[PDB]
mmCIF file of C-alpha atoms in Angstrom:
data_model
loop_
_atom_site.group_PDB
_atom_site.id
_atom_site.type_symbol
_atom_site.label_atom_id
_atom_site.label_comp_id
_atom_site.label_asym_id
_atom_site.label_seq_id
_atom_site.Cartn_x
_atom_site.Cartn_y
_atom_site.Cartn_z
ATOM 1 C CA UNK A 1 -39.535 28.946 -24.525
ATOM 2 C CA UNK A 2 -41.240 31.842 -22.861
ATOM 3 C CA UNK A 3 -44.597 31.701 -21.267
ATOM 4 C CA UNK A 4 -47.673 32.346 -23.186
ATOM 5 C CA UNK A 5 -49.950 34.788 -21.200
ATOM 6 C CA UNK A 6 -52.401 35.864 -23.870
ATOM 7 C CA UNK A 7 -53.702 34.797 -27.269
ATOM 8 C CA UNK A 8 -54.521 36.843 -30.284
ATOM 9 C CA UNK A 9 -55.448 36.056 -33.904
ATOM 10 C CA UNK A 10 -55.254 37.507 -37.379
ATOM 11 C CA UNK A 11 -57.915 36.636 -40.075
ATOM 12 C CA UNK A 12 -56.207 36.980 -43.536
ATOM 13 C CA UNK A 13 -57.294 37.314 -46.998
ATOM 14 C CA UNK A 14 -55.384 37.794 -50.491
ATOM 15 C CA UNK A 15 -57.986 39.212 -53.092
ATOM 16 C CA UNK A 16 -61.154 37.359 -52.720
ATOM 17 C CA UNK A 17 -59.219 34.092 -51.198
ATOM 18 C CA UNK A 18 -59.758 33.536 -47.410
ATOM 19 C CA UNK A 19 -56.192 32.009 -46.033
ATOM 20 C CA UNK A 20 -57.547 30.992 -42.517
ATOM 21 C CA UNK A 21 -56.743 31.998 -39.064
ATOM 22 C CA UNK A 22 -53.182 32.868 -37.819
ATOM 23 C CA UNK A 23 -53.396 32.241 -33.661
ATOM 24 C CA UNK A 24 -50.599 34.157 -31.877
ATOM 25 C CA UNK A 25 -49.425 33.656 -28.342
ATOM 26 C CA UNK A 26 -47.820 36.560 -26.290
ATOM 27 C CA UNK A 27 -44.992 36.366 -23.875
ATOM 28 C CA UNK A 28 -46.773 38.762 -21.325
ATOM 29 C CA UNK A 29 -44.281 37.913 -18.660
ATOM 30 C CA UNK A 30 -40.929 38.633 -20.537
ATOM 31 C CA UNK A 31 -42.223 41.692 -22.420
ATOM 32 C CA UNK A 32 -45.324 43.296 -20.730
ATOM 33 C CA UNK A 33 -45.324 46.486 -22.249
ATOM 34 C CA UNK A 34 -44.760 45.239 -25.774
ATOM 35 C CA UNK A 35 -47.536 42.531 -25.607
ATOM 36 C CA UNK A 36 -49.895 44.920 -24.285
ATOM 37 C CA UNK A 37 -49.248 47.360 -27.247
ATOM 38 C CA UNK A 38 -49.574 44.363 -29.630
ATOM 39 C CA UNK A 39 -52.832 42.867 -27.901
ATOM 40 C CA UNK A 40 -54.772 46.540 -27.528
ATOM 41 C CA UNK A 41 -53.661 47.024 -31.357
ATOM 42 C CA UNK A 42 -55.258 43.590 -32.298
ATOM 43 C CA UNK A 43 -58.542 44.588 -30.489
ATOM 44 C CA UNK A 44 -58.563 48.196 -31.295
ATOM 45 C CA UNK A 45 -59.839 49.680 -28.118
ATOM 46 C CA UNK A 46 -58.177 52.827 -28.733
ATOM 47 C CA UNK A 47 -59.872 53.303 -32.250
ATOM 48 C CA UNK A 48 -57.012 52.228 -34.463
ATOM 49 C CA UNK A 49 -55.018 48.941 -34.845
ATOM 50 C CA UNK A 50 -54.480 46.068 -37.128
ATOM 51 C CA UNK A 51 -57.783 45.221 -38.760
ATOM 52 C CA UNK A 52 -57.651 46.276 -42.378
ATOM 53 C CA UNK A 53 -54.036 46.601 -42.657
ATOM 54 C CA UNK A 54 -51.696 44.815 -44.884
ATOM 55 C CA UNK A 55 -48.329 42.870 -44.886
ATOM 56 C CA UNK A 56 -46.360 45.443 -46.931
ATOM 57 C CA UNK A 57 -43.371 43.413 -47.143
ATOM 58 C CA UNK A 58 -42.754 39.853 -47.749
ATOM 59 C CA UNK A 59 -39.218 38.273 -47.992
ATOM 60 C CA UNK A 60 -39.173 34.646 -48.839
ATOM 61 C CA UNK A 61 -37.214 32.415 -46.555
ATOM 62 C CA UNK A 62 -37.009 35.200 -44.052
ATOM 63 C CA UNK A 63 -40.132 37.015 -42.883
ATOM 64 C CA UNK A 64 -43.428 38.856 -43.481
ATOM 65 C CA UNK A 65 -43.763 42.351 -42.203
ATOM 66 C CA UNK A 66 -46.998 44.188 -41.473
ATOM 67 C CA UNK A 67 -48.492 46.654 -38.797
ATOM 68 C CA UNK A 68 -48.220 50.132 -40.727
ATOM 69 C CA UNK A 69 -52.003 51.005 -40.298
ATOM 70 C CA UNK A 70 -51.236 54.836 -41.121
ATOM 71 C CA UNK A 71 -49.240 54.792 -44.463
ATOM 72 C CA UNK A 72 -49.291 51.147 -45.736
ATOM 73 C CA UNK A 73 -45.744 51.238 -47.067
ATOM 74 C CA UNK A 74 -43.573 50.817 -43.837
ATOM 75 C CA UNK A 75 -42.939 54.184 -42.937
ATOM 76 C CA UNK A 76 -46.004 54.535 -40.629
ATOM 77 C CA UNK A 77 -47.617 53.163 -37.459
ATOM 78 C CA UNK A 78 -47.840 54.163 -34.043
ATOM 79 C CA UNK A 79 -48.191 52.514 -30.518
ATOM 80 C CA UNK A 80 -50.966 53.050 -27.912
ATOM 81 C CA UNK A 81 -48.312 54.712 -25.780
ATOM 82 C CA UNK A 82 -47.597 57.436 -28.235
ATOM 83 C CA UNK A 83 -45.040 57.319 -31.058
ATOM 84 C CA UNK A 84 -42.245 54.817 -29.711
ATOM 85 C CA UNK A 85 -41.524 53.122 -26.800
ATOM 86 C CA UNK A 86 -38.473 51.460 -25.299
ATOM 87 C CA UNK A 87 -36.834 48.228 -26.066
ATOM 88 C CA UNK A 88 -37.910 45.559 -23.235
ATOM 89 C CA UNK A 89 -36.182 42.447 -23.493
ATOM 90 C CA UNK A 90 -33.161 41.736 -25.970
ATOM 91 C CA UNK A 91 -32.112 38.499 -24.863
ATOM 92 C CA UNK A 92 -34.753 36.476 -26.515
ATOM 93 C CA UNK A 93 -33.456 34.754 -29.680
ATOM 94 C CA UNK A 94 -35.539 34.608 -32.944
ATOM 95 C CA UNK A 95 -36.831 31.214 -34.062
ATOM 96 C CA UNK A 96 -39.308 29.991 -36.813
ATOM 97 C CA UNK A 97 -42.636 31.592 -36.086
ATOM 98 C CA UNK A 98 -41.489 34.002 -33.824
ATOM 99 C CA UNK A 99 -43.129 37.783 -33.404
ATOM 100 C CA UNK A 100 -40.653 40.650 -33.258
ATOM 101 C CA UNK A 101 -40.931 44.321 -33.655
ATOM 102 C CA UNK A 102 -39.591 46.320 -36.267
ATOM 103 C CA UNK A 103 -37.594 49.427 -35.534
ATOM 104 C CA UNK A 104 -35.453 52.291 -36.683
ATOM 105 C CA UNK A 105 -32.744 51.669 -33.993
ATOM 106 C CA UNK A 106 -32.836 51.371 -30.300
ATOM 107 C CA UNK A 107 -35.876 52.310 -28.516
ATOM 108 C CA UNK A 108 -38.152 53.171 -31.515
ATOM 109 C CA UNK A 109 -40.697 50.410 -31.272
ATOM 110 C CA UNK A 110 -44.360 51.652 -33.038
ATOM 111 C CA UNK A 111 -46.718 49.099 -34.300
ATOM 112 C CA UNK A 112 -44.751 47.493 -37.134
ATOM 113 C CA UNK A 113 -43.782 43.684 -36.641
ATOM 114 C CA UNK A 114 -42.646 40.855 -38.309
ATOM 115 C CA UNK A 115 -43.041 36.994 -38.456
ATOM 116 C CA UNK A 116 -40.203 35.172 -39.064
ATOM 117 C CA UNK A 117 -40.208 32.129 -41.490
ATOM 118 C CA UNK A 118 -36.656 30.846 -41.180
ATOM 119 C CA UNK A 119 -33.496 31.593 -38.815
ATOM 120 C CA UNK A 120 -32.826 35.083 -38.653
ATOM 121 C CA UNK A 121 -29.858 35.311 -36.141
ATOM 122 C CA UNK A 122 -28.616 38.684 -37.510
ATOM 123 C CA UNK A 123 -31.852 40.157 -35.989
ATOM 124 C CA UNK A 124 -30.779 38.786 -32.492
ATOM 125 C CA UNK A 125 -30.464 41.358 -29.798
ATOM 126 C CA UNK A 126 -31.519 44.227 -31.819
ATOM 127 C CA UNK A 127 -35.366 43.507 -32.078
ATOM 128 C CA UNK A 128 -37.801 42.542 -29.168
ATOM 129 C CA UNK A 129 -39.164 39.024 -29.565
ATOM 130 C CA UNK A 130 -42.636 38.953 -27.938
ATOM 131 C CA UNK A 131 -44.698 36.219 -29.067
ATOM 132 C CA UNK A 132 -45.037 33.138 -31.510
ATOM 133 C CA UNK A 133 -47.511 31.742 -33.834
ATOM 134 C CA UNK A 134 -49.448 28.815 -31.956
ATOM 135 C CA UNK A 135 -51.647 27.833 -34.888
ATOM 136 C CA UNK A 136 -51.996 28.750 -38.437
ATOM 137 C CA UNK A 137 -48.182 28.607 -39.695
ATOM 138 C CA UNK A 138 -49.292 26.889 -42.918
ATOM 139 C CA UNK A 139 -51.129 30.441 -43.269
ATOM 140 C CA UNK A 140 -48.009 31.999 -42.793
ATOM 141 C CA UNK A 141 -45.957 29.906 -45.300
ATOM 142 C CA UNK A 142 -48.546 30.568 -48.008
ATOM 143 C CA UNK A 143 -48.428 34.185 -47.388
ATOM 144 C CA UNK A 144 -44.746 34.220 -47.871
ATOM 145 C CA UNK A 145 -44.893 32.359 -51.399
ATOM 146 C CA UNK A 146 -47.079 35.118 -52.769
ATOM 147 C CA UNK A 147 -45.851 37.297 -56.009
ATOM 148 C CA UNK A 148 -43.803 40.208 -55.003
ATOM 149 C CA UNK A 149 -43.417 42.510 -57.863
ATOM 150 C CA UNK A 150 -40.789 45.552 -56.605
ATOM 151 C CA UNK A 151 -39.348 46.449 -53.336
ATOM 152 C CA UNK A 152 -40.782 42.997 -51.776
ATOM 153 C CA UNK A 153 -44.129 44.220 -51.992
ATOM 154 C CA UNK A 154 -46.824 41.585 -52.691
ATOM 155 C CA UNK A 155 -48.483 42.663 -56.125
ATOM 156 C CA UNK A 156 -51.941 41.872 -54.474
ATOM 157 C CA UNK A 157 -52.620 43.081 -50.922
ATOM 158 C CA UNK A 158 -52.347 40.695 -48.145
ATOM 159 C CA UNK A 159 -55.092 41.785 -45.747
ATOM 160 C CA UNK A 160 -55.532 41.361 -42.222
ATOM 161 C CA UNK A 161 -59.690 41.525 -42.438
ATOM 162 C CA UNK A 162 -60.152 40.738 -38.667
ATOM 163 C CA UNK A 163 -58.196 40.520 -35.602
ATOM 164 C CA UNK A 164 -58.782 40.585 -31.851
ATOM 165 C CA UNK A 165 -58.383 38.664 -28.471
ATOM 166 C CA UNK A 166 -59.054 34.708 -28.403
#
């Protein structure tokens, strides 16, 4: 496993229901630019970030997806470096509990990420794995079972009510 160089957290709610804290460890040595973008979006030092954003897509036995704090539908988001930044490390394999950057092709990393819940080998080599859930995996598995109506969107918002560095 890669080395954990930092710890960030999400506090999750689903409509008048605290789900608990998800603790995330970052692979700051294998993906320094990617972890710094994620870390500073967790704290919000640049005036924007993950606080009060939602997980807009939930696919059972696959992944949950969030990070679109501009359009809330999977089309938006932006990095702290600008619009998009380059793929760093592509040799890390996905695993249950991994943090991985969503993209629209090579070198299109913004702020959208997913947390894998099952083996997803068809993403390997094409998405930058930059962290893992250290604690609160049961919260992730609870979020994964939420009711999705259409387009794999949760019928009730799965909201990150708080985020930052631990």
